[PDB]
Design an enzyme around this catalytic site. Structure first.
Site, mmCIF file in Angstrom:
data_model
loop_
_atom_site.group_PDB
_atom_site.id
_atom_site.type_symbol
_atom_site.label_atom_id
_atom_site.label_comp_id
_atom_site.label_asym_id
_atom_site.label_seq_id
_atom_site.Cartn_x
_atom_site.Cartn_y
_atom_site.Cartn_z
ATOM 1 N N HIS A 61 -10.155 -4.433 -1.022
ATOM 2 C CA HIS A 61 -8.661 -4.557 -0.900
ATOM 3 C C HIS A 61 -8.286 -5.931 -0.035
ATOM 4 O O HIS A 61 -7.692 -6.722 -0.416
ATOM 5 C CB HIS A 61 -7.958 -3.464 -0.117
ATOM 6 C CG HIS A 61 -8.820 -2.034 -0.203
ATOM 7 N ND1 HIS A 61 -8.416 -1.371 -1.430
ATOM 8 C CD2 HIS A 61 -9.685 -1.320 0.056
ATOM 9 C CE1 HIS A 61 -9.262 -0.467 -1.730
ATOM 10 N NE2 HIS A 61 -9.954 -0.350 -0.615
ATOM 11 N N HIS A 91 -7.535 -9.293 9.108
ATOM 12 C CA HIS A 91 -7.366 -9.351 7.744
ATOM 13 C C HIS A 91 -6.011 -9.878 7.265
ATOM 14 O O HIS A 91 -5.308 -10.040 8.089
ATOM 15 C CB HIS A 91 -7.652 -8.119 7.396
ATOM 16 C CG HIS A 91 -6.274 -7.136 7.505
ATOM 17 N ND1 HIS A 91 -6.568 -5.994 8.262
ATOM 18 C CD2 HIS A 91 -5.110 -6.997 6.863
ATOM 19 C CE1 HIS A 91 -5.204 -5.692 8.553
ATOM 20 N NE2 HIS A 91 -4.667 -6.078 7.379
ATOM 21 N N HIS A 93 -3.237 -10.338 3.836
ATOM 22 C CA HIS A 93 -2.583 -10.148 2.480
ATOM 23 C C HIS A 93 -2.103 -11.637 1.891
ATOM 24 O O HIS A 93 -1.297 -12.424 2.899
ATOM 25 C CB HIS A 93 -1.362 -9.056 2.700
ATOM 26 C CG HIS A 93 -1.643 -8.168 3.606
ATOM 27 N ND1 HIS A 93 -1.902 -6.750 2.912
ATOM 28 C CD2 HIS A 93 -1.940 -7.742 4.753
ATOM 29 C CE1 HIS A 93 -2.257 -6.085 4.015
ATOM 30 N NE2 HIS A 93 -2.149 -6.679 5.205
ATOM 31 N N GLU A 103 3.693 -9.460 3.651
ATOM 32 C CA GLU A 103 4.169 -8.090 3.847
ATOM 33 C C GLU A 103 5.678 -8.130 4.322
ATOM 34 O O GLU A 103 6.712 -7.613 3.816
ATOM 35 C CB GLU A 103 3.152 -7.188 4.540
ATOM 36 C CG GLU A 103 1.767 -7.418 3.738
ATOM 37 C CD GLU A 103 1.163 -6.032 3.902
ATOM 38 O OE1 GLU A 103 0.995 -5.490 5.009
ATOM 39 O OE2 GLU A 103 0.657 -5.620 2.676
ATOM 40 N N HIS A 116 -2.957 -10.091 9.914
ATOM 41 C CA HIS A 116 -2.888 -8.927 10.793
ATOM 42 C C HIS A 116 -4.004 -9.045 11.750
ATOM 43 O O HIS A 116 -5.399 -8.765 11.091
ATOM 44 C CB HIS A 116 -2.881 -7.692 10.015
ATOM 45 C CG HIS A 116 -1.687 -7.484 9.079
ATOM 46 N ND1 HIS A 116 -1.420 -6.586 8.036
ATOM 47 C CD2 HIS A 116 -0.282 -8.203 9.321
ATOM 48 C CE1 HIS A 116 -0.204 -6.788 7.623
ATOM 49 N NE2 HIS A 116 0.478 -7.714 8.459
ATOM 50 N N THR A 195 -0.090 -0.625 6.564
ATOM 51 C CA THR A 195 0.626 -1.028 5.300
ATOM 52 C C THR A 195 -0.483 -0.615 4.262
ATOM 53 O O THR A 195 0.144 -0.989 3.097
ATOM 54 C CB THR A 195 1.172 -2.605 5.221
ATOM 55 O OG1 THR A 195 -0.096 -3.212 5.366
ATOM 56 C CG2 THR A 195 1.954 -2.988 6.451
ATOM 57 N N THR A 196 -1.283 0.029 4.305
ATOM 58 C CA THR A 196 -2.273 0.198 3.597
ATOM 59 C C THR A 196 -2.554 1.609 3.627
ATOM 60 O O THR A 196 -2.638 2.455 4.830
ATOM 61 C CB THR A 196 -3.732 -0.317 3.375
ATOM 62 O OG1 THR A 196 -4.292 -0.285 4.506
ATOM 63 C CG2 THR A 196 -3.469 -1.966 3.691
HETATM 64 N N1 LIG Z 1 -2.375 -3.908 7.403
HETATM 65 S S1 LIG Z 1 -2.625 -2.934 8.636
HETATM 66 O O1 LIG Z 1 -1.494 -2.297 8.727
HETATM 67 O O2 LIG Z 1 -2.690 -3.654 9.740
HETATM 68 C C1 LIG Z 1 -3.801 -1.879 8.215
HETATM 69 N N2 LIG Z 1 -4.182 -1.207 7.273
HETATM 70 N N3 LIG Z 1 -5.396 -0.546 7.198
HETATM 71 C C2 LIG Z 1 -6.043 -0.730 8.077
HETATM 72 N N4 LIG Z 1 -7.198 -0.053 8.593
HETATM 73 S S2 LIG Z 1 -8.111 -0.464 9.999
HETATM 74 O O3 LIG Z 1 -7.432 0.568 10.903
HETATM 75 O O4 LIG Z 1 -7.905 -1.884 10.175
HETATM 76 C C3 LIG Z 1 -9.851 -0.009 10.028
HETATM 77 C C4 LIG Z 1 -10.204 -0.761 11.222
HETATM 78 C C5 LIG Z 1 -11.673 -0.490 11.470
HETATM 79 C C6 LIG Z 1 -12.270 0.622 10.863
HETATM 80 C C7 LIG Z 1 -11.636 1.352 9.902
HETATM 81 C C8 LIG Z 1 -12.444 2.277 9.076
HETATM 82 O O5 LIG Z 1 -13.382 2.264 8.277
HETATM 83 O O6 LIG Z 1 -11.935 3.619 8.917
HETATM 84 C C9 LIG Z 1 -10.902 4.142 8.122
HETATM 85 C C10 LIG Z 1 -9.580 4.193 8.867
HETATM 86 C C11 LIG Z 1 -8.922 5.479 8.051
HETATM 87 C C12 LIG Z 1 -8.680 5.527 6.555
HETATM 88 O O7 LIG Z 1 -9.619 6.294 5.817
HETATM 89 N N5 LIG Z 1 -9.420 7.527 5.855
HETATM 90 O O8 LIG Z 1 -10.184 8.532 5.145
HETATM 91 O O9 LIG Z 1 -8.315 8.158 6.265
HETATM 92 C C13 LIG Z 1 -10.347 0.960 9.476
HETATM 93 S S3 LIG Z 1 -5.123 -1.874 9.210
HETATM 94 ZN ZN LIG Z 2 -2.569 -5.778 7.028
#
Ligand SMILES: NS(=O)(=O)c1nnc(NS(=O)(=O)c2cccc(C(=O)OCCCCO[N+](=O)[O-])c2)s1
Ligand SMILES: [Zn+2]
Ligand SMILES: [Hg+2]
Length: 256
Positions: A61, A91, A93, A103, A116, A195-196
């Protein structure tokens, strides 16, 4: 699973993640003429001096730059925030063309990209506990336009060959995110979501007004990145952004 195309894009997300049509979803458009200056807002505090990046990952992504948050080193406090929020990752977009990518939009204006930086509330002890919480996360949003190069982004850009495809990680230590802030910390703030997927409604957004400018050649390398994993049909990683979502009479507040 979820992506950004015709068949798995933001318009399909609601099926696995019902909250996609919730009450505090992100991103939103920021109407500058409806936002209101907030006097109860504390000064914003971004302390990134002790930040410790570990690695960079293509996750199918975006790419995440990941930080060691076992200690209270890189932190957001102040602003709309109460207490301490620890930097876990950052990260972006971006678009396929320079007129799309962000976004969040400003008076409906789309920038070429958005950064972000993602932080968890330390009263919750881990990140995993924090995302079960309405005030669990703080994300710091920064717009990118195409102009002169951003020197502090160049290390990210050059490592992107390392992590072309879904799956690949690269050791990515000693990166300073301070190199990615614009000079002004003026901002808009609302309560919102990831947002994901899973689009969890756990985020205080702090979106910076002043965008950073990166080079045409810089954004161009982001676009060379792959959605697909190693040895699959080539889908260029472009337009990995969610469109603006209904405000639902939340109020966007301005620090200025
Ligand atoms: N664009 S945004 O609004 O800021 C985001 N959109 N997505 C974001 N993900 S994250 O916060 O960064 C993040 C961080 C560290 C480890 C992990 C990770 O590897 O664990 C999975 C998190 C739950 C998703 O999976 N799940 O089964 O529910 C994820 S942040
Ligand atoms: Zn983001
Ligand atoms: Hg939540």
């Amino acid at each position: 699973h979820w992506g950004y195309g015709k068949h798995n894009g933001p318009e399909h997300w609601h099926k696995d993640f019902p909250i996609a049509k919730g009450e505090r979803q992100s991103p939103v458009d920021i109407d500058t003429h409806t936002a209101k200056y907030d006097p109860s807002l504390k000064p914003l505090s971004v302390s990134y001096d002790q930040a410790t990046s570990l690695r960079i990952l293509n996750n199918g992504h975006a790419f995440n730059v990941e930080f060691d948050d076992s200690q209270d080193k890189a932190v957001l406090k102040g602003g709309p925030l109460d207490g301490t929020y620890r930097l876990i990752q950052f990260h972006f977009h971006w678009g396929s063309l320079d007129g799309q990518g962000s976004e969040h939009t400003v008076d409906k204006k789309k920038y070429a990209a958005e950064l972000h930086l993602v932080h968890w509330n330390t009263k919750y002890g881990d990140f995993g506990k924090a995302v079960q919480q309405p005030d669990g996360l703080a994300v710091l949003g920064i717009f990118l336009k195409v102009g002169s190069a951003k020197p502090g982004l160049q290390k990210v850009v050059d490592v992107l060959d390392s992590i072309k495809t879904k799956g690949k990680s690269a050791d990515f230590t000693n990166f300073d995110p301070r190199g990615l802030l614009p000079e002004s910390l003026d901002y808009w703030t609302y309560p919102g979501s990831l947002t994901t997927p899973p689009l969890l409604e756990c985020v205080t957004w702090i979106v910076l007004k002043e965008p950073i400018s990166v080079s045409s050649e810089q954004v161009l390398k982001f676009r060379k990145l792959n959605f697909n994993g190693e040895g699959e049909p080539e889908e260029l990683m472009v337009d990995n952004w969610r469109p603006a979502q209904p405000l639902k009479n939340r109020q966007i507040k301005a620090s200025f």
